Amino acid sequence: PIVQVHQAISPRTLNAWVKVVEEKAFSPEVIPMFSALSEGATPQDLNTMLNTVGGHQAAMQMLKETINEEAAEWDRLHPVMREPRGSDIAGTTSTLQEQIGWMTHNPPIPVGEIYKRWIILGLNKIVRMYS
Ligand SMILES: CCN1C(=O)[C@H](c2cc(O)cc(-c3cccnc3)c2)C(=O)N(c2ccccc2)c2cc(C(F)(F)F)ccc21
Numbered sequence: 001p002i003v004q005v006h007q008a009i010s011p012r013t014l015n016a017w018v019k020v021v022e023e024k025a026f027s028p029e030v031i032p033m034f035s036a037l038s039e040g041a042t043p044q045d046l047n048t049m050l051n052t053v054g055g056h057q058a059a060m061q062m063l064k065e066t067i068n069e070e071a072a073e074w075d076r077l078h079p080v081m082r083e084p085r086g087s088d089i090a091g092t093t094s095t096l097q098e099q100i101g102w103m104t105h106n107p108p109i110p111v112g113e114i115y116k117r118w119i120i121l122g123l124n125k126i127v128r129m130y131s
């Protein structure tokens with residue numbers, strides 16, 4: 001996350017989270033916990049976390065599809081320092097430096113916060129699917 005500059009979530013925190021998500025798989029109480037954990041997150045942070053958490057293969061694919069759908073919608077709503085496109089917000093086509101750039105620009109585009117809402121949309125769809 002960006003702190004008072006960028007620093008990775010600590011390994012101890014991420015590894016503990018992996019176990020929490022496993023124990024609480026597919027339950028909605030994970031969602032607010034995700035929001036708390038990812039305070040200040042860049043898209044790079046978020047992808048490291050998602051990749052570390054891993055989990056259920058079909059669920060991961062559904063999350064990915066949801067993200068891609070939201071990135072497409074972002075491009076429709078906000079066609080394009082350069083401005084980020086959907087894939088930049090998802091951290092696919094952007095660097096960590098670029099993400100920090102947008103997040104701290106005057107005025108800013110909070111690419112981490114935007115990506116978080118896409119991830120949360122996916123997590124909610126997953127909750128319903130496995131309920
Ligand atoms: C989408 C992929 N994914 C999993 O497959 C998780 C998972 C992890 C795991 O270690 C085991 C399972 C699992 C599920 C069912 C059977 N056996 C194992 C699922 C899991 O259950 N959820 C999940 C939890 C609650 C609600 C919705 C989804 C999350 C959560 C996140 C995060 F961090 F962003 F919140 C990231 C990936 C992720």
Ligand SMILES: O=C(O)c1ccc(-c2ccc3c(c2)nc(-c2cn[nH]c2-c2cccc(Cl)c2)n3CCCn2ccnc2)cc1
Pocket residue numbers: 078081082083084101102103105106107108109110113114
């Ligand atoms: O959902 C959300 O949370 C959400 C949704 C949208 C936005 C958003 C989107 C585009 C935005 C924006 C804010 N602020 C500006 C904006 C306004 N002036 N300069 C910029 C800007 C230019 C380049 C890089 C960055 Cl970093 C900012 N633009 C660029 C608009 C086009 N423009 C205006 C001036 N130059 C280019 C922020 C948050």
